[PDB]
CSV table of N, CA and C in Angstrom, one decimal:
chain,number,residue,atom,x,y,z
A,1,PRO,N,-135.2,-9.8,133.2
A,1,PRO,CA,-133.8,-8.1,134.1
A,1,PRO,C,-133.3,-8.1,135.7
A,2,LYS,N,-132.4,-9.5,135.5
A,2,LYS,CA,-131.5,-9.1,137.0
A,2,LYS,C,-130.5,-9.5,136.8
A,3,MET,N,-129.0,-9.4,137.3
A,3,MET,CA,-128.2,-9.0,137.2
A,3,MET,C,-127.5,-10.5,136.6
A,4,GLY,N,-126.3,-10.4,135.9
A,4,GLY,CA,-125.9,-11.5,135.1
A,4,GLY,C,-127.0,-12.6,134.2
A,5,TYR,N,-128.0,-12.6,133.9
A,5,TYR,CA,-128.7,-12.7,132.8
A,5,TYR,C,-129.5,-12.2,132.2
A,6,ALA,N,-128.2,-11.1,131.8
A,6,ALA,CA,-128.6,-9.9,130.7
A,6,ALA,C,-128.4,-10.9,129.6
A,7,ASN,N,-128.4,-10.8,127.7
A,7,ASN,CA,-128.0,-11.2,126.7
A,7,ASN,C,-128.0,-12.9,127.1
A,8,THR,N,-128.7,-13.6,127.7
A,8,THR,CA,-128.8,-14.8,127.8
A,8,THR,C,-130.0,-15.1,127.1
A,9,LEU,N,-130.3,-16.4,127.5
A,9,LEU,CA,-131.6,-17.7,126.5
A,9,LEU,C,-132.4,-18.1,127.6
A,10,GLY,N,-133.7,-16.9,127.9
A,10,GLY,CA,-134.5,-17.4,128.3
A,10,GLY,C,-135.1,-18.0,129.0
A,11,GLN,N,-136.1,-18.5,130.3
A,11,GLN,CA,-136.6,-20.0,130.2
A,11,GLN,C,-137.6,-19.3,130.4
A,12,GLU,N,-138.4,-20.8,130.7
A,12,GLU,CA,-140.2,-20.9,131.0
A,12,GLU,C,-140.5,-20.1,132.4
A,13,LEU,N,-139.9,-20.3,133.7
A,13,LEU,CA,-139.9,-19.7,134.4
A,13,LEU,C,-138.1,-19.8,135.4
A,14,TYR,N,-138.6,-17.7,136.0
A,14,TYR,CA,-137.9,-17.2,136.9
A,14,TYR,C,-138.3,-17.8,137.7
A,15,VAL,N,-137.3,-18.7,138.8
A,15,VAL,CA,-137.9,-18.7,140.4
A,15,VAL,C,-136.8,-18.2,141.3
A,16,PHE,N,-136.6,-17.0,142.1
A,16,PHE,CA,-135.7,-16.2,142.7
A,16,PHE,C,-136.4,-15.7,144.4
A,17,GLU,N,-135.5,-16.3,145.1
A,17,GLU,CA,-136.0,-16.3,146.9
A,17,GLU,C,-134.8,-15.7,146.9
A,18,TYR,N,-135.3,-14.8,148.0
A,18,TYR,CA,-134.7,-13.6,149.2
A,18,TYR,C,-134.7,-13.5,150.4
A,19,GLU,N,-133.8,-13.4,151.1
A,19,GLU,CA,-134.2,-14.1,152.5
A,19,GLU,C,-134.3,-12.0,153.7
A,20,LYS,N,-135.6,-11.9,153.7
A,20,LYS,CA,-135.2,-10.7,154.4
A,20,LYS,C,-134.4,-10.3,155.9
A,21,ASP,N,-134.8,-9.2,155.7
A,21,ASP,CA,-134.1,-8.2,156.8
A,21,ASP,C,-133.2,-9.3,158.4
A,22,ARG,N,-132.3,-8.8,159.4
A,22,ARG,CA,-133.3,-9.0,160.4
A,22,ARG,C,-133.0,-10.9,160.4
A,23,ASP,N,-133.6,-11.3,161.2
A,23,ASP,CA,-135.2,-12.1,160.1
A,23,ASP,C,-136.3,-13.1,160.6
A,24,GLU,N,-137.0,-11.8,159.7
A,24,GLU,CA,-137.9,-11.2,159.1
A,24,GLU,C,-138.9,-12.8,158.3
A,25,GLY,N,-138.0,-13.2,157.6
A,25,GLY,CA,-139.1,-14.0,156.3
A,25,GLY,C,-138.1,-14.5,155.3
A,26,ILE,N,-139.1,-15.1,154.5
A,26,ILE,CA,-138.2,-15.1,153.1
A,26,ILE,C,-139.4,-14.9,152.0
A,27,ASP,N,-138.6,-14.4,151.4
A,27,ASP,CA,-139.3,-13.1,150.0
A,27,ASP,C,-139.2,-14.4,148.8
A,28,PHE,N,-139.9,-14.1,148.0
A,28,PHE,CA,-139.9,-15.1,146.4
A,28,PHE,C,-140.8,-13.7,145.4
A,29,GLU,N,-139.9,-14.5,144.2
A,29,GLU,CA,-140.4,-14.0,143.0
A,29,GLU,C,-139.9,-15.1,141.6
A,30,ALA,N,-141.4,-14.7,141.4
A,30,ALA,CA,-141.4,-15.7,139.9
A,30,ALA,C,-141.0,-14.1,139.1
A,31,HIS,N,-140.7,-14.9,137.7
A,31,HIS,CA,-141.3,-14.1,136.3
A,31,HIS,C,-141.3,-15.4,135.2
A,32,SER,N,-142.0,-14.7,134.4
A,32,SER,CA,-142.2,-15.0,132.5
A,32,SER,C,-141.6,-14.1,131.9
A,33,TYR,N,-141.3,-13.8,130.6
A,33,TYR,CA,-140.9,-13.3,129.7
A,33,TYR,C,-141.4,-14.0,127.9
A,34,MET,N,-142.7,-14.2,127.7
A,34,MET,CA,-142.7,-14.5,126.7
A,34,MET,C,-144.1,-14.3,125.7
A,35,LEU,N,-144.1,-15.3,124.8
A,35,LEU,CA,-145.1,-14.9,124.3
A,35,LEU,C,-145.8,-16.0,123.3
A,36,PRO,N,-146.8,-16.2,123.1
A,36,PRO,CA,-146.5,-17.8,122.0
A,36,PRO,C,-147.6,-17.0,120.8
A,37,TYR,N,-147.3,-17.3,119.0
A,37,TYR,CA,-147.6,-16.8,118.2
A,37,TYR,C,-147.9,-18.2,116.4
A,38,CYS,N,-148.8,-17.6,115.9
A,38,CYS,CA,-148.4,-18.5,114.6
A,38,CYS,C,-148.0,-18.0,113.6
A,39,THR,N,-147.3,-18.6,112.9
A,39,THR,CA,-147.2,-18.2,111.7
A,39,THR,C,-147.6,-18.0,110.2
A,40,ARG,N,-149.1,-18.4,110.6
A,40,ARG,CA,-149.3,-19.7,109.2
A,40,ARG,C,-151.2,-19.1,109.9
A,41,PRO,N,-151.3,-18.0,110.4
A,41,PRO,CA,-152.7,-17.9,111.5
A,41,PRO,C,-154.1,-18.5,110.8
A,42,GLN,N,-154.0,-17.9,109.1
A,42,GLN,CA,-154.9,-18.3,108.3
A,42,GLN,C,-155.4,-19.3,108.0
A,43,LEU,N,-154.9,-20.4,109.3
A,43,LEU,CA,-155.5,-22.1,109.5
A,43,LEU,C,-156.3,-21.6,110.2
A,44,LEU,N,-156.5,-21.3,111.0
A,44,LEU,CA,-156.3,-21.1,112.8
A,44,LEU,C,-158.4,-20.0,112.6
A,45,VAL,N,-158.4,-21.8,111.3
A,45,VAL,CA,-160.5,-21.8,111.9
A,45,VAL,C,-161.3,-21.9,112.2
A,46,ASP,N,-162.4,-20.7,112.9
A,46,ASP,CA,-163.6,-21.0,114.4
A,46,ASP,C,-164.6,-21.1,114.2
A,47,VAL,N,-165.5,-22.7,113.5
A,47,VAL,CA,-166.9,-22.2,113.4
A,47,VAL,C,-168.1,-21.1,114.4
A,48,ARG,N,-169.0,-21.8,113.5
A,48,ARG,CA,-169.9,-21.4,114.2
A,48,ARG,C,-171.6,-22.4,113.7
A,49,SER,N,-172.3,-22.5,114.3
A,49,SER,CA,-173.7,-23.2,114.7
A,49,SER,C,-174.4,-22.6,114.0
A,50,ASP,N,-174.8,-21.1,113.6
A,50,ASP,CA,-175.4,-20.8,113.3
A,50,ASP,C,-175.0,-19.4,111.8
A,51,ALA,N,-176.4,-19.7,110.8
A,51,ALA,CA,-176.5,-19.5,109.5
A,51,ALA,C,-175.6,-18.1,109.2
A,52,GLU,N,-174.6,-18.0,108.5
A,52,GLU,CA,-174.3,-17.0,107.9
A,52,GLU,C,-175.2,-15.6,107.9
B,1,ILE,N,-77.4,33.2,167.3
B,1,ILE,CA,-76.5,34.1,167.8
B,1,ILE,C,-75.8,35.7,167.6
B,2,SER,N,-75.0,35.6,167.8
B,2,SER,CA,-75.1,37.3,168.0
B,2,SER,C,-73.6,37.7,168.0
B,3,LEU,N,-73.6,38.5,168.3
B,3,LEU,CA,-71.2,39.2,167.8
B,3,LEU,C,-71.2,39.5,169.2
B,4,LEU,N,-69.5,38.5,169.9
B,4,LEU,CA,-68.6,39.3,171.3
B,4,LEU,C,-68.4,40.5,171.6
B,5,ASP,N,-68.6,40.8,172.6
B,5,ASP,CA,-68.5,42.3,172.3
B,5,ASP,C,-66.8,42.4,173.7
B,6,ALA,N,-66.1,43.2,173.8
B,6,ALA,CA,-65.1,43.4,174.4
B,6,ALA,C,-65.3,44.3,175.3
B,7,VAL,N,-64.3,43.4,176.6
B,7,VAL,CA,-64.8,43.5,177.8
B,7,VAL,C,-63.6,44.4,178.4
B,8,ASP,N,-63.1,44.8,179.6
B,8,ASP,CA,-62.5,44.6,180.5
B,8,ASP,C,-61.9,43.6,181.4
B,9,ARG,N,-59.8,43.6,181.6
B,9,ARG,CA,-59.6,42.5,182.1
B,9,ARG,C,-59.9,42.2,183.5
B,10,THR,N,-59.8,43.3,184.1
B,10,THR,CA,-59.8,43.6,185.5
B,10,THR,C,-61.0,44.0,185.8
B,11,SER,N,-62.4,43.9,185.1
B,11,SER,CA,-63.5,44.3,185.5
B,11,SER,C,-64.5,43.0,185.8
B,12,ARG,N,-63.6,42.0,185.1
B,12,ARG,CA,-64.1,40.5,185.6
B,12,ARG,C,-65.3,40.9,184.3
B,13,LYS,N,-65.8,41.7,184.1
B,13,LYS,CA,-67.1,41.5,183.5
B,13,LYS,C,-67.2,40.3,182.1
B,14,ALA,N,-68.4,39.9,181.7
B,14,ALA,CA,-69.1,39.3,180.7
B,14,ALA,C,-70.3,38.8,179.8
B,15,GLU,N,-70.2,38.4,179.0
B,15,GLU,CA,-72.0,38.7,178.6
B,15,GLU,C,-72.1,36.8,177.8
B,16,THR,N,-73.6,36.6,178.6
B,16,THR,CA,-74.3,35.2,178.5
B,16,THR,C,-75.2,35.8,177.3
B,17,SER,N,-75.6,34.4,176.8
B,17,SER,CA,-76.4,33.9,175.8
B,17,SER,C,-77.7,33.7,175.8
B,18,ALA,N,-78.4,33.4,175.1
B,18,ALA,CA,-80.1,34.1,175.6
B,18,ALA,C,-80.7,31.9,175.1
B,19,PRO,N,-81.5,31.6,175.1
B,19,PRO,CA,-82.2,30.0,175.3
B,19,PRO,C,-82.7,30.2,173.8
B,20,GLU,N,-83.1,28.8,173.6
B,20,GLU,CA,-84.1,29.0,172.2
B,20,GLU,C,-85.3,28.8,172.3
B,21,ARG,N,-86.3,28.7,171.5
B,21,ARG,CA,-87.2,28.9,171.0
B,21,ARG,C,-87.8,27.2,170.6
B,22,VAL,N,-89.0,27.0,171.0
B,22,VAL,CA,-89.6,26.5,170.9
B,22,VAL,C,-91.0,26.3,170.6
B,23,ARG,N,-91.9,25.3,169.4
B,23,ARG,CA,-92.8,25.5,168.9
B,23,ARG,C,-93.4,24.0,168.3
B,24,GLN,N,-94.7,24.6,168.1
B,24,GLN,CA,-96.0,23.5,167.5
B,24,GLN,C,-96.7,23.8,166.4
B,25,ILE,N,-96.8,22.3,165.8
B,25,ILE,CA,-97.7,23.0,164.5
B,25,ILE,C,-99.0,21.9,164.3
B,26,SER,N,-99.6,21.9,163.6
B,26,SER,CA,-101.5,20.4,163.6
B,26,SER,C,-101.8,20.7,161.8
B,27,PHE,N,-102.0,20.2,161.6
B,27,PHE,CA,-101.6,19.6,160.1
B,27,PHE,C,-103.6,18.9,160.1
B,28,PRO,N,-104.0,18.9,159.4
B,28,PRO,CA,-105.7,19.0,159.0
B,28,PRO,C,-105.3,17.8,157.1
B,29,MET,N,-106.0,17.3,157.0
B,29,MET,CA,-105.7,16.0,156.3
B,29,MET,C,-106.7,16.7,154.9
B,30,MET,N,-106.6,15.9,153.3
B,30,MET,CA,-108.2,15.9,152.8
B,30,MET,C,-108.7,14.6,152.3
B,31,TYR,N,-110.1,14.8,151.9
B,31,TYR,CA,-110.7,13.9,151.8
B,31,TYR,C,-111.5,13.4,150.3
B,32,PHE,N,-111.2,12.8,150.0
B,32,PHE,CA,-111.9,12.3,148.5
B,32,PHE,C,-112.2,11.0,148.2
B,33,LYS,N,-113.4,10.6,147.4
B,33,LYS,CA,-114.5,10.0,147.0
B,33,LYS,C,-115.0,10.2,145.8
B,34,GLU,N,-115.1,8.6,145.2
B,34,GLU,CA,-115.4,8.6,144.4
B,34,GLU,C,-117.2,7.2,144.1
B,35,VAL,N,-117.9,7.4,143.3
B,35,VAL,CA,-119.0,5.8,143.4
B,35,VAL,C,-119.4,6.3,142.4
B,36,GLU,N,-119.1,5.1,142.0
B,36,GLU,CA,-119.8,4.9,140.3
B,36,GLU,C,-121.2,3.0,140.9
B,37,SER,N,-121.2,3.0,139.7
B,37,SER,CA,-122.5,1.8,139.8
B,37,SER,C,-122.3,0.7,138.4
B,38,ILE,N,-123.0,-0.4,138.4
B,38,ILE,CA,-123.4,-1.2,137.0
B,38,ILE,C,-124.6,-1.9,137.2
B,39,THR,N,-125.3,-1.5,135.7
B,39,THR,CA,-126.6,-1.5,136.0
B,39,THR,C,-127.0,-3.5,134.4
B,40,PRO,N,-127.8,-4.2,134.5
B,40,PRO,CA,-127.8,-4.4,133.4
B,40,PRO,C,-128.5,-4.1,132.1
B,41,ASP,N,-128.8,-3.0,132.2
B,41,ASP,CA,-129.4,-1.6,131.1
B,41,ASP,C,-127.9,-2.0,130.4
B,42,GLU,N,-127.1,-1.9,130.7
B,42,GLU,CA,-125.9,-1.6,130.1
B,42,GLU,C,-125.7,-2.3,129.9
B,43,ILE,N,-126.4,-3.8,129.4
B,43,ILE,CA,-125.7,-4.3,128.5
B,43,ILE,C,-127.0,-5.3,127.6
B,44,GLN,N,-127.1,-5.0,128.3
B,44,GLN,CA,-128.8,-5.7,127.6
B,44,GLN,C,-129.0,-5.3,126.4
B,45,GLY,N,-129.1,-6.2,124.8
B,45,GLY,CA,-129.2,-5.3,123.3
B,45,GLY,C,-128.4,-4.2,123.2
B,46,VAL,N,-127.4,-4.4,123.4
B,46,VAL,CA,-126.3,-3.4,123.4
B,46,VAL,C,-125.6,-3.6,122.3
B,47,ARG,N,-124.5,-3.1,121.1
B,47,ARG,CA,-123.8,-3.0,120.6
B,47,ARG,C,-122.8,-2.7,120.6
B,48,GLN,N,-122.0,-3.4,120.5
B,48,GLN,CA,-120.5,-3.0,120.7
B,48,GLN,C,-120.4,-2.1,119.5
B,49,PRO,N,-118.9,-0.6,119.5
B,49,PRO,CA,-119.4,-0.2,118.3
B,49,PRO,C,-118.2,-0.7,117.8
B,50,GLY,N,-117.5,-0.2,116.6
B,50,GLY,CA,-116.7,-1.2,115.6
B,50,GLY,C,-117.1,-2.5,115.6
B,51,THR,N,-118.3,-3.2,115.4
B,51,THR,CA,-118.8,-3.9,115.8
B,51,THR,C,-120.2,-4.3,114.1
B,52,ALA,N,-120.2,-5.2,113.8
B,52,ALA,CA,-121.1,-5.3,113.0
B,52,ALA,C,-122.7,-6.3,113.9
């Protein structure tokens, strides 16, 4: 959600470097807007070593 | 200016004229300011009216 990034293809990581005021140091920001998913979850079988 | 007044030829009398008058004035002025802003929330995922 920064200026110039609206309605654009997102990427894995957004790295932003900002200089502090006067001369006090460096500011950093890292962003990630992601969600993994599976379209056939019925194939995600889990196994157990005990009896039913 | 005024209107001349008749006088005698031997009394030698006459009439004079008054001076002018000068003044000074000042003027203050008017000030108007307008402010605006642009934010990515106005562009992100918003349909253009009249378009599908």
